[PDB]
Amino acid sequence: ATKIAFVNFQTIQQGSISKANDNSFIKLSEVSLDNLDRLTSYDMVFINGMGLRIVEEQRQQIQQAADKGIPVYTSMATNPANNICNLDSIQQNLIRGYLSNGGKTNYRNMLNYIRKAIDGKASAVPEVEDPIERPSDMLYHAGISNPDDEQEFLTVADYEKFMQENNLYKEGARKIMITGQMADATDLIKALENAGYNVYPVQSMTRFMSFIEEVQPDAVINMAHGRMGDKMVDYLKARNILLFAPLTINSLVDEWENDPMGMSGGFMSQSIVTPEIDGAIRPFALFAQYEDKEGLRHSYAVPERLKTFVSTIDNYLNLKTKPNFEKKVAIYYYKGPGQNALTAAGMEVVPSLYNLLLRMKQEGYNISGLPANAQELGKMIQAQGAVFNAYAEGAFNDFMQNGHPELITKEQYESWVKESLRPEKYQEVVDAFGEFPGNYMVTPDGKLGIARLQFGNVVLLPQNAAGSGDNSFQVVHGTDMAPPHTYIASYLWMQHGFKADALIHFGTHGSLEFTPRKQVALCSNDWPDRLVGAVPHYYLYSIGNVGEGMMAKRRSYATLQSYLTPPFLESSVRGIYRELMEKIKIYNNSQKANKDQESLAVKTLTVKMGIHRDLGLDSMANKPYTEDEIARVENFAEELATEKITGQLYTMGVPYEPERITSSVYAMATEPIAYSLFALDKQRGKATESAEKHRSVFTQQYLMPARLLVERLMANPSLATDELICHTAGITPQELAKARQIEAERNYSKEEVEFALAVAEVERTIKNVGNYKNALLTSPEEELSSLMNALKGGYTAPTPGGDPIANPNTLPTGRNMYAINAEATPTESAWEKGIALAKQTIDRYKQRHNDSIPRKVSYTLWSSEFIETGGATIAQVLYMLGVEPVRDAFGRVSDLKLIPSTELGRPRIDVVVQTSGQLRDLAASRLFLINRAVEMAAAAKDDKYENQVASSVIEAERVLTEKGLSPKDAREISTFRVFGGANGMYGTGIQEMVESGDRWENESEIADTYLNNMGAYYGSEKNWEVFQKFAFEAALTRTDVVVQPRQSNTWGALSLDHVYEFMGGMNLAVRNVTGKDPDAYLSDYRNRNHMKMQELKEAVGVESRTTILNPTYIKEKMKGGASSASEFAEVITNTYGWNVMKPAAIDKELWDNIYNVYVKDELNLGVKQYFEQQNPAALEEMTAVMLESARKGLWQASEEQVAELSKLHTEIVNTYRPSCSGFVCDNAKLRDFIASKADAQTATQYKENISKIR
Ligand code: HEM
Ligand code: NA
């Protein structure tokens, strides 16, 4: 008897081989990847190398069987290190021939050949035959009489003659081409022909462009495995057609619907990530598997998914033929509660909406009733398009009688639900909110109201709340959140009542793509899939937020359209700190032995301006600063003078001012030139030590000279010649030639590679200075033209992501963004930068703690910084432990190696990681490497230095045993190190609790909530999303440092609300567990040629002195509208949040400065009149936040300051009516505090105004 073993084989192919077997002396068996030690009892071994993932030990077991004398063959290995074979050349060709071609005839001949040739014991076996060869490029179709038989054709003419004989050809019909081999598409082909199309099935792996050009189809459907190429992208742009890409699941239907992930690892990259670079859309799950009577798997298309897919194809193709005068479009925007303004990331929303409607009217769309100008449009939206909170009963009862909403009856709602949703999922809505219509905006008759504003065939709707205002801040484990009736009825009315032809989301970003449950490859139980339906979907997104835009593409099936960012300018604060710089200049040039009188002069001004608080220095009477302390002051002041700030917000269809065009190009080009020249001088061995220690010297030698060069090239772009490049860099012409040659090979010693990269940065920047100015002027026009083309069924070209300063390749805008492949991270470049940043973290800690190293470091991982840096934050985590990645021949990281203790030169340091929901979708396999590396380092024995990773495991186990856990459980849980949100939610849920000031008393209540909401475990696939009590707490012991990444030039620590939600929350939780406040650092990725670590309190001082206390910044913002005024209230709210999380980072003098500017008008700018005419609701929020800090004790304000704030607050409310946000209309204790500080007559009038809305 002959025994043959199969390893890591696919279920479908393995079953086919076993069926084709007919000899009674051939036995087939399967061996798992953990049973490789049984291979010595077999006569032949087959190994599937397609996507195999093994370790060195597993590889060694296979290698030993080959040297024993066991025949081994590996099929289609992707990693060359796994290619193991010990057969003759003739035998390899024969086995490959049978296997590659396939078919049941080839399979059975293969089994007989093994027993005859390889085994040797001929005995009883029939005659074998040569493998049968199949065409590699052809068109195929199923047999008309016998569908089991398949027809093959070699030319397009042969196929077209076949169709006419069988009456499959329709005159004048549209053509669709199908490519790919991942699944059986017999049902898809037949369903499309019943719809009235001509279908051309093509199976050609290499030369598919020859077939496409002869047919000239109207659409292409690809079952993608990999990327098609750049030749395909050029054809699509020239022909202006679409490309689709459905998905395939290799399991049963029931198994797929119970999996919380869907896809991961290499298979996700081949199916989703890589096709996006070509510009594919609609990653719709269509194919699955089923078992037959005998027990064999087969591939088919799910009948319910097939109906929705064919309907989607019709809708996209009908956009091209339907006249513009009959199309219907729906647009969604995001608005604040009450009387707050419309918001989007760096955009003026209301003027942008008006410009879009004017463009559509010219194109021929049916738009009527449009107001005169954008000011009139804003008033109509407030009157007929507002949203309200749950507690403002008096507010939305008045809207029902003055806003004329859309009324939905019970019969309409139930017919829509029975057609779109599943009975079990709709039952969850009833359990949480009750029967239709609910309680929010309900007429006495029993109907539901929808707020909308319609102009002919175009309707505008606001987006409601996706959750419930239960005011329960702790998440319950095991239950998902369902949207309320109002949220559901809005999207179902669009599909069935309004019958829209297209759907648009206006700005960054909504909340539809963050609803439960599955990550990718959604099913019929997922809300984002059901609420969109079969309607074409378009989404306007900003280029500075690439990380979060991937959720919209992969979960809501959206096509992204990119728009610009606000312009940049200089801070212009150099004149304020000019006197301080002169004192430092004299001190540096003093050659006297005793430089104390000069040192005391510098100290006097530093204390007067309050700078000593930002740098953590002393304010002693007669103690002069040392040499090192003065150097720190000089660098802090020079950083303020060279800071870049954003100006007026961006309006669609309007370019920048001529002055702002000039300054934006200055920001995009000065820095790359200056730092590239600095690197070249350092390598050649020049006197660069002085400039590297002082930033004032660097400005005079590398920054100012580079600014003049940019000025010349802007006026005369024709001077960008090879003579200017060689002379600017100080290199001879022949050296420039070899520099371009190294770039060509990679698209040599380590020194040469570094030299080549610096030269390429200088050359690339100089030759594109003229293009930068032209791209900014023409971008606003291309954004409107690209959107009009999309609404006619055209093609949108792909693009990468990132703000123009970080990545100049993102211009012009109006394109579709994509991401990177996560299986190759951390990259070679990212590994070098991560090592350098990890050494700065240790050095900075030792300076402040007397040469001591930390015991544990904590990290936060975000999606946007992962894509743009290539995984630089993961490199820092691995280097702390002392583990390095291992790469294969194709640059993919799948294994780890331990760094020897002597080479490390220091003790190992333990880590703990928290993640966001967006990151877990992009790179889930990288999280498995991090937790595997922790267990590798904790088992490392015989180290020259101390192993602090092993000490943390012992301490964590002791805590768990004290809490009352089993000895077996305590040992297992003591190694959990990766955590995230509970129930798979995308955030922490802590902003709602912090900003509800009257519902908590101590900070220990907030800490308990944070530990509950972020205590889920995501460190392995087997225990994915498992909650264990006390697991998060035991992992935070002995923590010393908290690290937060930062990569964008558009937001800072005080301007983004997520920063204090994650970084602040971790800081608060550690303080309550260890009893000691840790250090907080920032990883600065903004300058790609110069990365550094910065202290949190120093970064706050820089931002406040340049944005909210800077007269230049304020006057730029006072030229905008309602959206610009809303940013002032957002910064004040984040300052309140930071004071709760980390009290030591916010000084009392910071609150006083804000008071002098916005309550007293110290700078004489007239800020109060600006708010009264643009957005009175933003001024109410600012005064209420400041009064809440005084009540809680966070700010030690005086009686005069409190009286003035209370007087201003009640005056705005009585004149312009309450806005009713959380602070103004839902804080009972704050209401009483304000009333007692004002006049008795004013108090009564103030109280009655609030009661009219509640
Ligand atoms: C009948 C033909 C093929 C089938 C059924 C197939 C199927 C698969 C599957 C199932 C995986 C993932 C394995 C796993 O996740 O365990 C994979 C990975 C992969 N395949 Fe294919 N494939 C085929 C042909 C090809 C070809 C011709 C190429 C040429 C380059 C290719 C390139 C890749 C790559 C790059 C990966 C990623 C592996 C990794 O990242 O570790 N495949 N393939
Ligand atoms: Na957000």
Ligand code: NA
């Ligand atoms: Na907030």
